[PDB]
Design a protein around this ligand. Sequence first.
Ligand code: CL
Length: 233
Amino acid sequence: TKFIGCIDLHNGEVKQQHPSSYYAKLYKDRDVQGCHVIKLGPNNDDAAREALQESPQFLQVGGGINDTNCLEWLKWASKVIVTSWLFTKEGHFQLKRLERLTELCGKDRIVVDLSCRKTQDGRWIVAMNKWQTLTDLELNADTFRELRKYTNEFLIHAGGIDELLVSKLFEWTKDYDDLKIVYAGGAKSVDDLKLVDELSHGKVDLTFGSSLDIFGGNLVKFEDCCRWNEKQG
Ligand SMILES: [Cl-]
């Protein structure tokens, strides 16, 4: 279990003041591997490239990723993160679209980002279009078994963390040794690192974003998250 950093971009600006390259440099300097730059809506491409080019092939990029632009983004991103393109506007999962991305990029350069909503006890359904659309894809062991054929990494995007979900991510992927699972679910305590480590037997990584001091949050220290990583080896 490691701390994963992020940079969210909206209207060409970081969601927080510092430009995107500041954060890209910081993550590189502190050797925070596997961070994600996420474009929320349009007009973010320059700010995304600013971050990626500050630390070339070190940060991932998501938001508006499809078969037409994935190779160009991979010039500067370590991996591309697919989101809504895997679904029709009606919310139907399109496995053939994932297969196309893998065919173009390689399984080591794509991330499948699934935003999920807990509908009922022990049930999580993938959602799209700013959460407002439930898709026909459920999170469960079967979904992980099938989709891991096409990617080496999932970003699972969901007060405290959804502890039961983290436990389930472990349970559903226990037999996979080569699969990276990044959880992003609003963590706002440094204590969540050890908690996620315990729940997942070390197999799930944890994003911190807006709660961090470096983004103007007053809840979690970025340096504490880096120190956690440094202790893991
Ligand atoms: Cl990466």
